[PDB]
Design a protein around this ligand. Structure first.
Ligand code: CLA
Ligand code: CLA
Ligand code: CLA
Ligand code: CLA
Ligand code: CLA
Ligand code: CLA
Ligand code: CLA
Ligand code: LHG
Ligand code: KC2
Ligand code: II0
Ligand code: II0
Lengths: 92, 173, 177
């Protein structure tokens, strides 16, 4: 009980949730984004990332930087669709 | 609502307070992040792009003595590439980086609420002392900067397509 | 709120007490370090740089009779001159630092005695008799020391690039390249 208080970063909120979905503070800067916005973002990100990955699957000695960058949208789309769910079930 | 896009709801973040606010955010990019940060970025882009457009025209019209020898027939990004080797772009980068470190301090102040976005207290000639004149000037600055972003995009991409600077292109087409 | 950077808040430490303060500390060094130590460092740098800039300018024109001391370029002179003399200068400078500070020469110990920053007691001719005169001079020492820091930096770098002395490089600017 004599342990020193644990320092945490500024503006650290309570994100623990036993509800159906988290509190939308889990999404940080994107907490106010709409569920429809997240859905469209996830679909667009998935399509663009899949296309840019296919444009690089037989990787050459000189891959395109824009295709490399856009390939990172496929992992991004997962987070986006998870957020869409969270924001749909948080009321938005 | 959304006067700009009449079939969409007014953006939640945009309440119409800021200059040049016509409720334009169809994709809802103001919801993500802080609107003060986005306004600082927008004004930075506005000023930089209108300087860039005026510079494109002025480089097309006039060139400083002895620059023709260094750059040959290069225009626009060709001039950029030619003078990176020379070192002019390096010096510009050094000095702009100095100014941008201080602008980083300014942005940190803005996010804390101390500084209005895009306000660096730069008013040597004293224009805008009168509040109404300052408001008019702010709206004109935002509108001209947006027009200039679009104009510089058009100029650079017209150079890409044709290889001709803005006014040299306009002369012949 | 800062006289020098009007779009930034005034540094908390800088309140106009010390001469030469125009509220210029954009990076917040004063908050992290002792302002007295910072001023001591500033004045030491300015004095060394003033002496250095005058040294380069006088060197390029006036030389000692010996060959080893006949290099118009200061950077090349540093290596042409005997190393024993340079190390003697180093040791004498170390002794002067030791004595002038009083052996208390550290962030925590230098100002235990309470001497004002930049005051090592060196006023042989007693030119500080008049308080008003001392004040303005105090600012000049600062302004001129800052100017000399920047000027000597320019001199040495322009001696690296051109390979000539300060004024020779200034007057031999290559306008046609
Ligand atoms: C986005 C802004 C921008 C950028 C990135 C550049 C970049 C460049 N310009 Mg410059 N230029 C600009 C704006 C800009 N310009 C403007 C607004 C003008 C009109 C005055 C010019 C007029 C101009 C000429 C006539 C020439 C260049 C040239 C060049 C090149 C070498 C640098 C030089 O000599 O500049 C010189 C520019 C100046 C001394 C004027 C700068 C004025 C600043 C931006 C405004 C300051 C306002 C102040 C705070 C109040 C380089 C690619 C040279 C080149 O290679 O052309 C092909 C050249 O000969 N520029
Ligand atoms: C479209 C032009 C335009 C307009 C209308 C304004 C308007 C304004 N600027 Mg400025 N500004 C501009 C371009 C412009 N700016 C550009 C391109 C830069 C980058 C160099 C800046 C950089 C800048 C800073 C750093 C700051 C301002 C600020 C201001 C405000 C106070 C000063 C004032 O009254 O300016 C009067 C404006 C004019 C008389 C018009 C200038 C037109 C020139 C003379 C023609 C250019 C010719 C070309 C180079 C060749 C005001 C809202 C201050 C503020 O509070 O911002 C919110 C501030 O801190 N501006
Ligand atoms: C090493 C030299 C040095 C030192 C120790 C100081 C110390 C001080 N100055 Mg500064 N000053 C200097 C050089 C120095 N100055 C020079 C050369 C100038 C002329 C431009 C000034 C001009 C000046 C003014 C006008 C004022 C001060 C003030 C102050 C005080 C408060 C600000 C502060 O904390 O600065 C501490 C600063 C440093 C320790 C320097 C840090 C350097 C960083 C780490 C790297 C810099 C790299 C490079 C040189 C920058 C350009 C990079 C480029 C390539 C992009 C403090 C006592 C204020 C005052 O009087 O307060 C009482 C004040 O109003 N100074
Ligand atoms: C404080 C900075 C500084 C430093 C690091 C040096 C360093 C040097 N000076 Mg000196 N010099 C300085 C200031 C400085 N000087 C000043 C202020 C003057 C004008 C009075 C001179 C005038 C001067 C001459 C005339 C010569 C040197 C020379 C030299 C070199 C040999 C040492 C010598 O004879 O010194 C002599 C130091 C003094 C007479 C002044 C010391 C007191 C400050 C050496 C690289 C020699 C050299 O190689 O020149 C290329 C040389 O001939 N210096
Ligand atoms: C403490 C007393 C002292 C002593 C015994 C010496 C002795 C010497 N110094 Mg001198 N020197 C002194 C103080 C002293 N110095 C001081 C206070 C300075 C100014 C910081 C110098 C700066 C100096 C330089 C720059 C050089 C000498 C050099 C010399 C040598 C030749 C000149 C001579 O005969 O004298 C000799 C070993 C020269 C040498 O070749 O030394 C190895 C030489 O280049 N001295
Ligand atoms: C070899 C002996 C010697 C000794 C004991 C010292 C001691 C000191 N120097 Mg240094 N200094 C030396 C040689 C020496 N110097 C030489 C040869 C030069 C070149 C002229 C300098 C130039 C110099 C400057 C420009 C500064 C110091 C500073 C300092 C102080 C802090 C040093 C530190 O580690 O922090 C301290 C009093 C700093 C100081 O006084 O900070 C308050 C400071 O700004 N010194
Ligand atoms: C107050 C101090 C000072 C002074 C008087 C000078 C003076 C000079 N420097 Mg500079 N210089 C200084 C500090 C200073 N420097 C510092 C602190 C550094 C950082 C280490 C440099 C680094 C530096 C380099 C690397 C070079 C110079 C060069 C020059 C010369 C030509 C610069 C020029 O025309 O730029 C051209 C641009 C302008 C005049 C525009 C100025 C900006 C607006 C318009 C005002 C000139 C004699 C050049 C030289 O000697 O080349 C052989 C050179 O290459 N300087
Ligand atoms: C790995 C290498 C890391 C070493 C970098 C050390 C730079 C320390 C630089 C540093 O912080 O020194 C600054 C310090 C003066 O600072 P202050 O006056 O705040 O005192 C230092 C402490 O007393 C307080 O932290 O200088 C001295 O004390 C003289 C010795 C140096
Ligand atoms: C008014 C201000 C001014 C500006 C802002 C400016 C900017 C630039 C830039 C931009 C970054 C470059 C890259 C550049 C390059 C060259 N300048 Mg130039 N310059 C200015 C003025 C003069 C004057 C008066 C002269 C001159 C010259 C040369 C020569 C020599 C070539 C050679 O002789 O082979 C070259 C290569 C001399 C010359 O030849 O002029 C016929 C000459 O007398 N410049 N100049
Ligand atoms: C604020 C302030 C000051 C200041 C200042 C300064 C220096 C202010 C400078 C303001 C500037 C330089 C404004 C430039 C605006 C340019 C625009 C809108 C360009 C549009 C181009 C278009 C639409 C285009 C195009 C085109 C396209 C796309 C295709 C091309 O083939 C050609 C074509 C042309 C047809 C001062 C000094 C007074 C002091 C005061 O105390 C503080
Ligand atoms: C302590 C004390 C006393 C004292 C004293 C003394 C001895 C005081 C001595 C003070 C001195 C020597 C001050 C020197 C300042 C020099 C400056 C500012 C140089 C700037 C150069 C620049 C900007 C430059 C440059 C240049 C560059 C970069 C590139 C070059 O190619 C061109 C160029 C040259 C233009 C006394 C004896 C009265 C006793 C009293 O009790 C108090």
């Amino acid at each position: 009980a004599g342990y020193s208080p644990v320092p945490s970063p500024d503006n650290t909120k309570e994100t623990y949730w036993e509800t159906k979905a988290p509190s939308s503070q889990v999404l940080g800067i994107g907490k106010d984004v709409s569920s429809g916005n997240y859905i469209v973002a996830s679909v667009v990100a998935a399509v663009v990332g899949a296309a840019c990955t296919g444009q690089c699957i037989p990787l050459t000695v000189s891959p395109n930087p824009v295709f490399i960058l856009g390939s990172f949208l496929l992992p991004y789309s997962w987070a986006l669709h998870v957020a869409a769910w969270i924001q749909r079930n948080n009321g938005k | 609502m959304s006067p700009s896009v009449p079939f969409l709801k007014r953006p939640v973040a945009l309440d119409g307070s800021m200059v040049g606010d016509v409720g334009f955010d169809p994709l809802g990019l103001s919801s993500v992040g802080d609107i003060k940060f986005l306004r600082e970025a927008e004004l930075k882009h506005c000023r930089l792009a209108m300087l860039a457009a005026a510079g494109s025209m002025a480089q097309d019209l006039y060139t400083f003595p002895g620059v023709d020898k260094v750059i040959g027939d290069a225009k626009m990004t060709a001039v950029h590439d030619k003078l990176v080797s020379q070192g002019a772009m390096g010096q510009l980068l050094v000095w702009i980086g100095f100014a941008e470190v201080f602008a980083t301090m300014a942005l940190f102040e803005t996010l804390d609420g101390k500084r209005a976005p895009g306000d660096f207290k730069f008013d040597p000639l004293g224009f805008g002392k009168n509040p109404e004149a300052l408001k008019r000037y702010q709206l004109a600055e935002i509108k001209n900067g947006r027009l200039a972003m679009l104009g510089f995009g058009g100029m650079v991409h017209g150079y890409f397509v044709t290889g001709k600077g803005p006014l040299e292109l306009l002369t012949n087409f | 709120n800062s006289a020098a950077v009007p779009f930034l808040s005034r540094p908390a430490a800088l309140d106009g007490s010390m001469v030469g303060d125009v509220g210029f500390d954009p990076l917040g060094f004063t908050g992290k370090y002792d302002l007295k130590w910072l001023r001591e460092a500033e004045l030491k740098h300015g004095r060394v740089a003033m002496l250095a800039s005058l040294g380069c300018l006088v060197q390029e024109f006036i030389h000692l009779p010996f060959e080893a001391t006949s290099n118009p370029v200061a950077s090349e002179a540093f290596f042409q001159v005997p190393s024993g003399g340079l190390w003697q200068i180093f040791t004498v400078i170390g002794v002067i630092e030791h004595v002038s500070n009083g052996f208390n020469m550290s962030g925590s110990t230098m100002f235990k005695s309470g001497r004002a920053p930049g005051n090592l007691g060196f006023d042989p001719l007693n030119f500080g008799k008049n308080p008003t005169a001392r004040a303005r001079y105090e600012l000049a020492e600062l302004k001129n020391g800052r100017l000399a820091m920047l000027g000597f930096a320019g001199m040495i770098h322009g001696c690296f690039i051109t390979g000539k002395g300060p004024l020779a490089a200034l007057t031999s600017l290559d306008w046609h390249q």
